[PDB]
Amino acid sequence: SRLNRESVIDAALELLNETGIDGLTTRKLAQKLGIEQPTLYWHVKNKRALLDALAVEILARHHDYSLPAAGESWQSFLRNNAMSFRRALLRYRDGAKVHLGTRPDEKQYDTVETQLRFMTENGFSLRDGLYAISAVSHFTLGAVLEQQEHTNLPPLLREALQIMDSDDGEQAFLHGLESLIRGFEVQLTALLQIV
């Protein structure tokens, strides 16, 4: 079938849902695309290349809150950014695993640079803005991965497991996110005060 970049990424994302990341293979991708393996090789060299592209494309297609709105607080940007990020990672099977360990792509530079600059414009040093952003990413990644991978007792554990059996992960994520954000705020506002 058609083998332009968009079509290959389309088939690859469809395949990723069928197989998950560890099961996804260029052999299976070729079969999906109605092509022989050496044809596919011309377009996509190996699994790693493909995964790196899927990481970019999942966000490009689905992660829509990548920039603060006009006049938006840094707290509110991080919140919305995290929710958007989480929902994009959840859209494909093992999407958080696809994303892990990737560095911003060239096509993401202006976005990520704006995010970093925005934090500095709200009083964070670059370093502290980065650490806030990284913590949001890491928390959201851990929560998504745990959600996507979870797919006699003592009484509090029994209860806790009932609690987790009770939603998709959203409620715990949102509560934890608020805690994170408020902690950043306590840190920012402290300036050089002991806190």
Ligand X SMILES: Cc1c2c(c(O)c3c(O)cccc13)C(=O)[C@]1(O)C(=O)C(C(N)=O)=C(O)[C@@H](N(C)C)[C@@H]1C2
- Rounded Cα distance, 28 and 10, in Å: 14
Binders in 51-70 for ligand X, by CB under 6 A: 59, 63, 66
Residue (of 106, 131, 135, 115) closest to 66 by Cα position = 115
**Closer residue to a copy of itself (CB): 18 or 149:** 149
Q: What is residue 170's DSSP assignment?
A: H
Q: State yes or no: residue 147 binds ligand X (CB under 6 A).
A: no
Residue (of 13, 14, 38) closest to 27 by Cα position = 38
Q: Interface residues with a copy of itself (CB under 8 A)?
A: 22, 100-101, 103-104, 106, 109-110, 112-113, 116-117, 120, 126-128, 130-132, 134-135, 137-143, 145-146, 148-157, 159-161, 163-164, 171-173, 175-176, 178-184, 186-187
**Closer residue to ligand X (CB): 50 or 95:** 95
- Rounded Cα distance, 112 and 172, in Å: 27
Q: Token pair for residue 148? A: 């996507």
Binders in 1-60 for ligand X, by CB under 6 A: 59
Q: State yes or no: residue 164 binds ligand X (CB under 6 A).
A: yes
**Closer residue to ligand X (CB): 115 or 147:** 115
Residue (of 195, 187, 78, 194) closest to 125 by Cα position = 187
**Choosing among ligand X, K ion, Cl ion, none, which partner's interface includes residue 126 (Cβ < 5 to 8 Å by kind)?**
K ion
Which residue of 16, 33, 96, 133 would you call a contact of ligand X, by CB under 6 A? 133
**Choosing among a copy of itself, Cl ion, ligand X, none, which partner's interface includes residue 63 (Cβ < 5 to 8 Å by kind)?**
ligand X
Half-sphere exposure of 46 (CA within 13 A, CB side): 1
Q: How far is CA 48 from CA 26, 51, 112, 174, 182, in A?
A: 10, 5, 23, 32, 37
Q: State yes or no: residue 4 binds Cl ion (CB under 5 A).
A: yes
**Closer residue to a copy of itself (CB): 49 or 160:** 160
Q: How far is CA 139 from CA 27, 45, 52, in A?
A: 34, 32, 21
Give the footprint of ligand X on this chain (CB under 6 A): 59, 63, 66, 81, 85, 103-104, 108, 111-112, 115-116, 133, 136-137, 160-161, 164
